[PDB]
Amino acid sequence: ERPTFYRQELNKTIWEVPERYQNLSPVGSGAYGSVCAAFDTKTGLRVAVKKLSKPFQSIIHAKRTYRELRLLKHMKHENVIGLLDVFTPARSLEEFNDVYLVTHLMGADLNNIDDHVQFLIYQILRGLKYIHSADIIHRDLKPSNLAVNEDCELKILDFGLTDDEMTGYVATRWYRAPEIMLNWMHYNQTVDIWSVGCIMAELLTGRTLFPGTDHIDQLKLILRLVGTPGAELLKKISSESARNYIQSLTQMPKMNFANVFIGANPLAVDLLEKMLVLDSDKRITAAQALAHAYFAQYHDPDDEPVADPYDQSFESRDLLIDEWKSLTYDEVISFVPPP
């Protein structure tokens, strides 16, 4: 039942959207495409519309388009960005060239912003429990992909999705777990818990926890706080080069977190000590952290949902452009809006 589309030149490209979406206005860059704010006249919601940039340009692009669509279609949680709508002006698979994604328009990210800290981190962990239960890892959680509305209600964006933008004194690398940053090992879900620790610390102090000037300076800032690796962790580092470099470092003990986070709620300090553990096997999980005394005022086990199973078998699959495009098209066509 095809809606009527109209055309409008915005982000140096012609946007072609259903009539329901009015007053389009550029917000900026999103993940793999440009974003416009819009009023959805059907739902009464202020929405963000993302037009993907050349979504089937290559195999890597076609697969990444499929991947983002699948991830967004899966996520049905208050604290996680999901899909309100997806459309294409194309009438068939043959003319399918553009994908538009629609979600809630948020008010500010965590850059643009103790009881407040409890509430914000609670929601991140609530959302992360849900994402992690589906065997999804965010991989790049940072204040800029965490957004709030007016009531400080939070959603996580850009989950599940280069060398130069990770280089130097840049916020793009400051929230990354040491094992990802230096590619130590095949990493788990608590890389995101490391990120939550970095963000929580920053909300509490108003300062970046590990503002490294490069990968190596950042590692040193990390190890000064949490200590140098012991034998047990060194064994778990499969990268022989990386393991060898670690062993060149002067050994350092873990610092006292109460002397770093002076004046902070001791339950906040305790939680930070459990999130910011060097060995990712021993880091607190999202489900465990929600039960921590710090969130006593917000914690409700009956209101902390988990996700339906997420089939990501497509990830290990190699297909042609036209095959990823066809799969993408099927997912667009089969979309059913939320209530």
Ligand X SMILES: C[C@H](O)CNc1nc(Oc2ccc(F)cc2F)nc2[nH]nc(-c3ccccc3Cl)c12
- The DSSP-derived string for 50-93 is EEESSTTSSHHHHHHHHHHHHHHHH---TTB---SEEE-S-SSG
| Partner residues linked to 35 by β-bridges | 28, 50
Binding mask 218-237 for ligand X (x = CB under 6 A): --------------------
Structure tokens at 130: 């849900």
First to last CA, the chain: 18
Q: Is 10 in the site for ligand X (CB under 6 A)?
A: no
Question: Annotated binding residue at 90?
Answer: no
Q: Is 271 in the site for ligand X (CB under 6 A)?
A: no
Figure out which of the listed residues 80, 110, 157, 233 binds ligand X, where binding follows CB under 6 A.
Answer: 157
CA 206, CA 211: separation in Å to the nearest integer?
A: 12
Return the DSSP state at 197.
Answer: H
Cβ(114)–Cβ(265) under 8 Å?
yes
Catalytic residue among 85, 98, 158, 192: 158
The CA-atom distances, in angstroms, between 278 and each of 99, 141, 199, 253 are 40, 17, 16, 12
Task: Report in angstroms how near the CB of residue 285 gets to ligand X at its nearest.
Answer: 25
Figure out which of the listed residues 24, 35, 38, 276 binds ligand X, where binding follows CB under 6 A.
Answer: 35
Q: Is 127 in the site for ligand X (CB under 6 A)?
A: no
Task: Report in angstroms how near the CB of residue 58 gets to ligand X at its nearest.
Answer: 21
Task: Report in angstroms how near the CB of residue 82 gets to ligand X at its nearest.
Answer: 8
Q: Is 24 in the site for ligand X (CB under 6 A)?
A: no
Q: Is 133 in the site for ligand X (CB under 6 A)?
A: no
Q: Is 203 in the site for ligand X (CB under 6 A)?
A: no
User: Is 163 in the active site?
Assistant: no
Question: Annotated binding residue at 35?
Answer: yes
Figure out which of the listed residues 131, 147, 193, 275 binds ligand X, where binding follows CB under 6 A.
Answer: 147
Q: Is 108 in the site for ligand X (CB under 6 A)?
A: yes
Q: Is 88 in the site for ligand X (CB under 6 A)?
A: no
CA 25, CA 130: separation in Å to the nearest integer?
A: 32
Residues between 46 and 65 that touch ligand X (CB under 6 A): 48-50
Return the DSSP state at 167.
Answer: S
Crossing angle of helices 191-205 and 266-275, in 10° steps, is: 150
Residue 289's Cβ-side half-sphere holds a number of Cα atoms within 13 Å equal to: 31
Contact set with ligand X (CB under 6 A): 27, 30-31, 35, 48-50, 72, 81, 83, 101-106, 108-109, 144-145, 147, 157-158
